[PDB]
């Protein structure tokens, strides 16, 4: 699978656009944009040898971890540290069979119990998601709390926070120009903060907006989406016009029509 | 005012494409555009020194006539052959004052008891808009029945049938950049041909059409709007996105909102 690599160390929102510029690259093939959107890969019919791609993330520490990213929804599917690879639950044995074709060659491959989803994810870190500070110092933690779980050294809820910075850092970026403003912003003044409404709302909604569009009558939605703003103030969204410098890439939800 | 030259003289697709080009840039100012839909200036308060552009056509019978085009809808408010000038009926004193400002040098000044609509012009004239032919030579005898009537030499019904003519291959061809390319269409293999069902939805509609896109939520509508293809089966409208190939310009309905 092609490889992307990004170090915290010394990053700068320009290495960092760079960064998020290719992983888009690579999730992307171009075939499928609808109303200047990008759709990412059907998985029925996708091959496995085009299903991954990954992304070596290097610290300032020296420390290496490689995350395994599914193209057909640009989420973590689990990572590579040393000698051992973990997997989230498979939630399906098509996703099952997929991941064995994953750092083969690692000597121990483990697969937890439990699946990548915040939901899960912020009960075993016992912090949501609005509580757990972004930036490249929190990415700098992280890659070293991923690292050392393969040696003993990092408790689970510790796993399970460094999971959400990389995942939101990573795959939600990848996915919304606005998050990866979001995260450029915290670069360059190096701030380090929770996410605030507007960013946990559009991740919970990256499913209904992919579907919203897809299925819209000429880019009208039939019926509107509640989002927040910084301020937490609600505010609808009635067609695909707004959305589209906010949202970067749609997973496949149906066939685009004549 | 500033005038508009153009002949039916050896016109050519690029001639007539560079004609309708200079009309739409006279009428907007660029100030206003809404969904990357130019919008014409309101006409509340809007300068009398502002509200005009002129036309002068000429054709192979070196024939001249100059048409005056009100800014605030492209339509055709009269016109100047030699020594006469004729305006339709105005709709409101504004309009019967603005027009005193035209053509002030004619010696003969008369304004008609009807006005410029499609339905009294088409009463006239004694035949639809469906069954009059449009196309370069069309264009070129209507100049001259323009201009004879300044001279007993047009009858009524010709006269109504000639602006019929005028006001379709020029005010909405540039209102429409549909329609502008079925002029263009006949010029190229120098056929004329009666307008058909998409082309005359689209004239009936350009009131409700600019509505409906400055009053819509992101640029969906609350309701559709249904057109017609060429082959006369309808059409429903529900965004914006789809008419930005085909219209050019709209009439101002309202302020844009922030």
């Known amino acids: 699978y092609p490889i992307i690599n990004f ?5 700068t ?19 499928d944009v609808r109303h200047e ?6 998985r029925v019919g996708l091959p496995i040898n085009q299903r991954f791609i990954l992304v070596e993330l290097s610290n300032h520490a020296e420390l290496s971890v490689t995350l395994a990213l599914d193209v ?6 689990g990572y590579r540290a040393g000698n051992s690879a973990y997997f989230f639950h498979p939630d399906n044995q098509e996703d099952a ?8 060659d690692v000597q121990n491959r483990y697969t937890f119990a439990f699946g990548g989803n915040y939901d899960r994810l912020e009960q075993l870190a016992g912090n949501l998601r609005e509580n757990i500070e972004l930036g490249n110092g929190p990415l700098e933690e992280a890659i070293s709390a991923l690292y050392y779980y393969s040696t003993g050294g990092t408790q689970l809820p510790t796993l399970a926070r ?21 995260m450029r912003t915290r670069i360059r003044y190096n701030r380090r903060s929770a996410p605030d409404p507007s960013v946990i709302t559009l991740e919970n909604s990256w499913g209904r907006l992919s579907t919203a569009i897809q299925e819209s009558n000429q880019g009208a ?8 703003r ?6 609808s969204v009635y067609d695909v016009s707004i959305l589209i410098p906010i949202i970067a890439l749609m997973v496949y939800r149906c066939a685009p029509p004549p």
């Open 72 to 77: 057909t929804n640009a989420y973590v599917v």
């Open 13 to 31: 929102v320009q290495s960092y656009t760079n960064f998020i510029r290719a992983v888009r690259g690579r999730l992307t093939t171009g075939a």
């Open 221 to 228: 939605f039939a019926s509107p989406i509640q989002l927040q």
């Open 97 to 104: 069979e997929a991941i064995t074709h994953l750092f083969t």
């Open 162 to 182: 460094s999971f959400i910075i990389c995942i939101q850092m990573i795959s939600e970026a990848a996915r919304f120009q606005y998050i990866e403003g979001e």
């Open 7 to 11: 170090t915290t160390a010394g990053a």
């Open 230 to 235: 910084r301020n937490g103030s609600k505010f």
């Open 37 to 42: 959107i990008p759709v990412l890969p059907n």
